[PDB]
Scaffold this active site. Structure first.
Site, PDB file in Angstrom:
ATOM      1  N   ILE A  51       0.844  -1.189   0.000  1.00  0.00           N
ATOM      2  CA  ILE A  51       0.000   0.000   0.000  1.00  0.00           C
ATOM      3  C   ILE A  51       0.882   1.243   0.000  1.00  0.00           C
ATOM      4  CG2 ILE A  51      -1.597   1.396   1.348  1.00  0.00           C
ATOM      5  CD1 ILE A  51      -2.670  -1.374   2.445  1.00  0.00           C
ATOM      6  N   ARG A  93      -2.267 -12.282   1.683  1.00  0.00           N
ATOM      7  CA  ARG A  93      -1.106 -13.142   1.476  1.00  0.00           C
ATOM      8  C   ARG A  93      -1.186 -14.482   2.211  1.00  0.00           C
ATOM      9  NH1 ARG A  93       3.087  -8.630   2.739  1.00  0.00           N
ATOM     10  NH2 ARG A  93       3.349  -7.426   0.804  1.00  0.00           N
ATOM     11  N   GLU A 104      -1.761  -8.327   4.477  1.00  0.00           N
ATOM     12  CA  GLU A 104      -1.231  -9.544   5.110  1.00  0.00           C
ATOM     13  C   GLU A 104      -2.263 -10.696   5.077  1.00  0.00           C
ATOM     14  OE1 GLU A 104       1.899  -9.762   5.369  1.00  0.00           O
ATOM     15  OE2 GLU A 104       2.827  -8.083   6.373  1.00  0.00           O
TER      16      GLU A 104
HETATM   17  N1  LIG Z   1       3.938  -6.020   3.871  1.00  0.00           N
HETATM   18  C1  LIG Z   1       3.026  -5.732   2.781  1.00  0.00           C
HETATM   19  C2  LIG Z   1       2.165  -4.528   3.143  1.00  0.00           C
HETATM   20  O1  LIG Z   1       2.847  -3.730   4.109  1.00  0.00           O
HETATM   21  C3  LIG Z   1       4.045  -3.165   3.579  1.00  0.00           C
HETATM   22  O2  LIG Z   1       4.801  -2.577   4.636  1.00  0.00           O
HETATM   23  C4  LIG Z   1       6.044  -3.247   4.833  1.00  0.00           C
HETATM   24  C5  LIG Z   1       6.835  -3.244   3.531  1.00  0.00           C
HETATM   25  O3  LIG Z   1       6.246  -4.519   3.333  1.00  0.00           O
HETATM   26  C6  LIG Z   1       8.203  -3.889   3.722  1.00  0.00           C
HETATM   27  O4  LIG Z   1       8.941  -3.806   2.504  1.00  0.00           O
HETATM   28  C7  LIG Z   1       9.074  -2.459   2.056  1.00  0.00           C
HETATM   29  O5  LIG Z   1       8.334  -1.597   2.916  1.00  0.00           O
HETATM   30  C8  LIG Z   1       8.332  -0.251   2.443  1.00  0.00           C
HETATM   31  C9  LIG Z   1       7.744  -0.208   1.038  1.00  0.00           C
HETATM   32  O6  LIG Z   1       8.798  -0.326   0.076  1.00  0.00           O
HETATM   33  C10 LIG Z   1       9.756   0.295   2.457  1.00  0.00           C
HETATM   34  O7  LIG Z   1       9.834   1.402   3.362  1.00  0.00           O
HETATM   35  C11 LIG Z   1      10.750  -0.779   2.882  1.00  0.00           C
HETATM   36  N2  LIG Z   1      12.101  -0.294   2.681  1.00  0.00           N
HETATM   37  C12 LIG Z   1      10.546  -2.059   2.081  1.00  0.00           C
HETATM   38  O8  LIG Z   1      11.317  -3.115   2.664  1.00  0.00           O
HETATM   39  C13 LIG Z   1       8.981  -3.199   4.835  1.00  0.00           C
HETATM   40  N3  LIG Z   1      10.245  -3.881   5.037  1.00  0.00           N
HETATM   41  C14 LIG Z   1       8.190  -3.201   6.138  1.00  0.00           C
HETATM   42  C15 LIG Z   1       6.823  -2.557   5.948  1.00  0.00           C
HETATM   43  N4  LIG Z   1       6.235  -3.179   7.159  1.00  0.00           N
HETATM   44  C16 LIG Z   1       3.687  -2.097   2.554  1.00  0.00           C
HETATM   45  O9  LIG Z   1       4.168  -0.888   1.978  1.00  0.00           O
HETATM   46  C17 LIG Z   1       2.230  -2.227   2.126  1.00  0.00           C
HETATM   47  O10 LIG Z   1       1.660  -0.921   2.224  1.00  0.00           O
HETATM   48  C18 LIG Z   1       1.855  -3.689   1.909  1.00  0.00           C
HETATM   49  O11 LIG Z   1       0.457  -3.782   1.609  1.00  0.00           O
END
Ligand SMILES: NC[C@H]1O[C@H](O[C@H]2[C@H](O)[C@@H](O[C@H]3O[C@H](CO)[C@@H](O)[C@H](N)[C@H]3O)[C@H](N)C[C@@H]2N)[C@H](O)[C@H](O)[C@@H]1O
Ligand SMILES: *[C@@H]1O[C@H](CO)[C@@H](O)[C@H](O)[C@H]1NC(C)=O
Length: 246
Positions: free
Chosen positions: A71, A163, A160
Site C-alpha cells: 500500500i 497473502r 497480510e
Molecule cells: N507487507 C506488505 C504490506 O505492508 C508493507 O509494509 C512493509 C513493507 O512490506 C516492507 O517492505 C518495504 O516496505 C516499504 C515499502 O517499500 C519500504 O519502506 C521498505 N524499505 C521495504 O522493505 C517493509 N520492510 C516493512 C513494511 N512493514 C507495505 O508498503 C504495504 O503498504 C503492503 O500492503
C-alpha cells in the site's frame, strides 16, 4: 477496484473482500499452485484501488501496488497521502491526481519505520474488524502519529490477510473483538519475501528450499520450513512475491 464495508461486516463479508483483493492481483503463472505476482506492471495498471468504508459509511481509497501488495498511499475526501519513499512518490504520479492537496507522510511504509512513528511495536497493537473501522476513521483526518498506528492495522487486515490464509482467519476471529496478533501472525508477515523466494527456488530443487525459513507456529513454537510439503506452502500462503523483486 475492490470494496469492503464495515457496516454490517461479519467473517463472511470480510472473507469475500479478501478473496476479491487476491483476485484483483494479476498473475500469469502459479508456482506450486500459488499465484505468482508479476515482475512489473507499467502505468496506472500497477495500482489497485481499495474502497474501504467505516461503520458510519465514510470512505478512504487505498492504493496498492499489484506486484507486491504494498500500500503506497490513500485518499481521504480531497486530500491524498503517500509514504515517504520512492515507490510511493512514483505511485503519486498515477493515483488520486484529482486530489486538491497531497501530503507526504513523515515516514516510509516499512514496519521498521511505522512502529517508530506509532510509538509501539505491532505486537502491542490490537487488530481486527473493529480496529480496521478505527483505522479508517483515523486516516480521514490527518494526524501522522495516529496514522502510523492506523496504517499498521490497515496493512495487516488487508495485505497480510490477502497473502496468508492464517492471517485472514485471525482477523475473522477478531470480527467483533480486537486482539493483538499472534506470534505466528508476526512471523508470517516478516517471512513473506523469504517464503516467496524459497518456494520459487524450490521449482528447480525438487521442492526443497535452498535456505530454510524459520517461523513461529500457532501453539507458539518455533519451526523450520524446509520444503513445499509444509502446511505453510500447501494451505497458508496465497500469493508469491516474484524473485525479480527480491
Ligand atoms: N507487507 C506488505 C504490506 O505492508 C508493507 O509494509 C512493509 C513493507 O512490506 C516492507 O517492505 C518495504 O516496505 C516499504 C515499502 O517499500 C519500504 O519502506 C521498505 N524499505 C521495504 O522493505 C517493509 N520492510 C516493512 C513494511 N512493514 C507495505 O508498503 C504495504 O503498504 C503492503 O500492503
Ligand atoms: C519436508 O518437510 C517436512 C515437514 O513439513 C519434514 O518432515 C521432512 O523431513 C522434509 N523433507 C525434506 C526432504 O526436507
Amino acid at each position: 477496484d475492490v470494496s469492503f464495508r464495515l457496516s454490517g461486516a461479519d467473517p463472511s463479508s470480510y472473507g469475500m473482500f479478501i478473496k476479491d483483493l487476491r483476485n484483483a492481483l494479476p498473475h500469469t503463472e502459479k508456482v506450486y499452485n500459488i499465484p505468482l505476482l508479476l515482475p512489473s506492471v507499467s502505468g496506472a495498471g500497477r495500482y489497485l484501488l481499495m474502497h474501504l468504508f467505516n461503520y458510519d459509511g465514510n470512505t478512504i481509497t487505498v492504493a496498492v501496488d499489484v506486484t507486491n501488495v504494498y500500500i503506497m498511499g490513500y485518499l481521504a475526501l480531497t486530500t491524498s497521502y503517500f509514504f515517504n519513499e520512492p515507490a510511493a512518490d512514483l505511485a503519486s504520479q498515477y493515483v488520486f491526481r484529482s486530489a486538491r492537496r497531497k501530503i507526504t507522510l513523515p515516514y516510509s511504509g516499512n514496519y521498521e519505520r511505522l512502529q517508530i512513528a506509532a510509538g509501539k511495536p505491532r505486537e502491542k497493537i490490537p487488530i481486527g474488524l473493529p480496529a480496521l473501522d478505527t483505522a479508517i476513521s483515523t486516516l480521514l483526518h490527518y494526524d501522522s502519529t495516529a496514522a502510523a498506528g492506523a496504517l499498521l492495522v490497515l496493512i495487516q487486515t488487508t495485505a497480510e490477510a490477502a497473502r496468508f490464509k492464517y492471517i485472514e482467519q485471525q482477523i475473522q476471529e477478531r470480527a467483533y473483538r480486537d486482539e493483538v496478533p499472534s506470534s505466528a501472525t508476526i512471523s508470517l508477515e516478516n517471512s513473506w519475501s523469504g517464503l516467496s523466494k524459497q518456494i520459487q527456488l524450490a521449482q528447480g530443487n525438487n521442492g526443497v528450499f535452498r535456505t530454510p525459513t524459520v517461523l513461529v507456529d500457532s501453539k507458539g513454537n518455533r519451526v523450520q520450513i524446509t520444503n513445499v510439503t509444509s502446511n505453510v506452502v500447501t494451505s497458508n500462503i496465497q500469493l508469491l512475491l516474484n524473485t525479480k523483486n527480491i
